[PDB]
């Protein structure tokens, strides 16, 4: 029986696999769809602050500039999102 | 209403906060406890392969050698765990 933490991690792999193309990477329109579908409250908190997270997320996370997001770059994105939530838990405003 | 993905991320912050000391970092015995409590099936799969993940995890993840695991180093650990699960989902053996 997996724990909540283990299920969470497995769920992130399964989420990545909803959006990959045949080359095992996520293209730009698919990454935006993934964000809208899985992080809509995160995105809404950004909006309220005047920030359109989807304007630049692909360009910021496509570190090797191959116009795809691979699993390592996907993990980096999740780490950015987690870092925002962590800042919020310390009293920061969202999407700072 | 948060989504499953957003709840997962928030859950990782709350998990980090179960184990921090006053300086907002996780010390070595606490990190091992966190692993045993939250990733026991992950650890058991390692064992079966002949790998004791807890022998070196602290030393591998304490990148700045301050004898604490801060949030950024905690995210790196989660990314290692996710990368293992991702490899498994592609047919690799666990804890490779
Ligand atoms: Ca890329
Ligand atoms: Ca450290
Ligand atoms: Cl893939
Ligand atoms: Cl903290
Ligand atoms: Zn994959
Ligand atoms: Zn904290």
Residue numbers in the entry:
A (entry chain A), B (entry chain A): 1 to 96
Copy text verbatim from the article accompanying this structure deposition.
S100 proteins are a family of small, EF-hand containing calcium-binding signaling proteins that are implicated in many cancers. Hallmarks of the S100 protein family include their small size (~ 100 aa) and the presence of a canonical (calmodulin-like) EF-hand motif and a non-canonical (S100-specific) EF-hand motif.
S100A7D24G eluted as a dimer from the SEC, and crystallized with one monomer in the asymmetric unit of the tetragonal cell. The S100A7D24G and S100A15 structures aligned closely with an r.m.s.d of 0.719 Å over 96 Cα atoms. Subtle adjustments were observed in the orientation of the histidine ligands, due to differential packing of surface loops between the monoclinic and tetragonal crystal forms. While crystallization of S100A15 was completed in the presence of zinc, S100A7D24G was crystallized in the absence of zinc, and yet zinc binding was observed in the same geometry. These observations indicate that the zinc-binding observed in the S100A15 is not an artifact.
